[PDB]
Amino acid sequence: APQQINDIVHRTITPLIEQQKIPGMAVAVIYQGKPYYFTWGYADIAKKQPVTQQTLFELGSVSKTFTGVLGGDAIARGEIKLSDPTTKYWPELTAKQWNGITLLHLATYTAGGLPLQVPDEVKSSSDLLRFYQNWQPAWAPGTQRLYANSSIGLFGALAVKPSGLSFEQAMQTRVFQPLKLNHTWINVPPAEEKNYAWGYREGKAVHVSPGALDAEAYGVKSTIEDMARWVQSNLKPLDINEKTLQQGIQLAQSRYWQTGDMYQGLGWEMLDWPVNPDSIIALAARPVKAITPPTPAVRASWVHKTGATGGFGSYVAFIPEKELGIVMLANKNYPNPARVDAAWQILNALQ
Ligand SMILES: *[B]([O])([O])[C][N]S(=O)(=O)[C]C1=[C][C]=[C][C]=[C]1
């Protein structure tokens, strides 16, 4: 890498790793549309396996950006509309509270207080139906945002129904394959296990366990190379050959709702650039203002998403107007503010 990129990355990340006691980390900086990679530490402490550019990390809720884009691609295909009632795709959802809750509300956490987590007791298609049927909204649709796996996770499951494909098959054929994300997985194949980092929670090696709507809400695993390619794709959707996918990326970066200084996309979240860095809790209910109609992807934005599982902490941020972006993948779930601080320190320096 150019020495400026080398220096700011190492001077920012080395101390982060020390302060947070992160066992292993991979970073990619996208600078004028070219990726530069950095790795530190261990993918597997016990077996002494280093982090490499081929190490798989759990992305946690960064997966929601993939779900949002897949949904966007389904809209572009004409298979679904965000204005469609949820019941159009799940007619068994007959309980009255569902009247007026649209796919947009699911995708953007504005359905009226769907909970952060699907309970562990929920397994089957039947258990899930019962869960959503029994759920009692706190609020009317489109009035408050409550970040939730059970909201965007259901969006992802319903969005692929017209396609006939499983969520995983749809993601592979419509997003991963076209973008050449050939080391990105919802389920890690046995051939790739050698590269699957362990996560670390309280010193114990852990991987994410199966749960309802996991693939849709928090279940993607990826390498630093594929994630840099994901960032490139989202920075410059017009270079993408598949028409509906190019459209879907654009739809995911549209601004649907505003709370404070932040705008909610499909998966992605955005603020106006330049952003006050300090401007960038188990449950956080916030009133939203509808953006009527949604603002198409704004190039002068800080576009980002944090992700976690029990054992992993991920962050992605990019600024389209500067052709600049960063991916930080770690096998410890360390505090969000520390991720954002480090990302801003690096991008601000390069911008
Ligand atoms: B996202 O913001 O990374 C989702 N957060 S989560 O708490 O649901 C991640 C998770 C999932 C399964 C088990 C533990 C933690």
Three-state secondary structure along 140-184? CCCCEECCCHHHHHHHHHHHCCCCCCCHHHHHHHHHHHHHCCCCC
CB atoms within 10 A of CB 47: 9
Q: How far is CA 189 from the centre of its chain?
A: 21
Residue 150 marked in a binding site: no
Residue 348 marked in a binding site: no
Name the resolution in angstroms.
1.6
Q: Whose CA is nearest to atom 7 of ligand 1?
A: 309
- Find, among 223, 277, 310, the residue nearest to 27 by Cα: 223
Q: Is the CB of 307 under 6 A from ligand 1?
A: yes
- Find, among 156, 147, 184, the residue nearest to 70 by Cα: 156
Residue 187 marked in a binding site: no
Q: Is 164 left (phi over 0), alpha (psi -120 to 50) or beta?
A: left
d(CA 196, CA 193): 5
- Find, among 151, 146, 148, the residue nearest to 132 by Cα: 151
Contact 33, 322 (CB under 8 A): no
What is the Å distance from ligand 1's center to 143 Cα?
A: 24
55 φ/ψ angles, rounded to the nearest 5 degrees: -65, 130
Residues acting as catalytic residues: 61
Atom of ligand 1 nearest to the CA of 217: 4
d(CA 31, CA 10): 16
Residue 50 structure tokens: 């280093």
Atom of ligand 1 nearest to the CA of 64: 1
Q: Is the CB of 149 under 6 A from ligand 1?
A: yes
SS3 of residue 15 by DSSP: helix
What is the Å distance from ligand 1's center to 218 Cα?
A: 6
What is the Å distance from ligand 1's center to 310 Cα?
A: 7
Contact 175, 73 (CB under 8 A): yes
- Find, among 259, 267, 268, the residue nearest to 286 by Cα: 259
Give the dihedral sign, CA 330/331/336/337.
negative
Give the dihedral sign, CA 327/330/333/339.
negative
Residue 233 marked in a binding site: no
Q: Is the CB of 265 under 6 A from ligand 1?
A: no
Residue 218 marked in a binding site: no
Q: Is the CB of 68 under 6 A from ligand 1?
A: no
Contact 208, 214 (CB under 8 A): yes
The maximal CA–CA distance of the chain, rounded, in angstroms, is 61
Contact 154, 135 (CB under 8 A): no
332 pairs with which residues across the strands?
Answer: 200
d(CA 153, CA 133): 16
- Find, among 186, 128, 137, the residue nearest to 158 by Cα: 128
Q: Whose CA is nearest to atom 4 of ligand 1?
A: 61
Q: Is the CB of 310 under 6 A from ligand 1?
A: yes
User: 1-351: what fold?
Assistant: Beta-lactamase (3.40.710)
d(CA 333, CA 207): 12
Q: Which residue has the tokens 């080391």?
A: 183
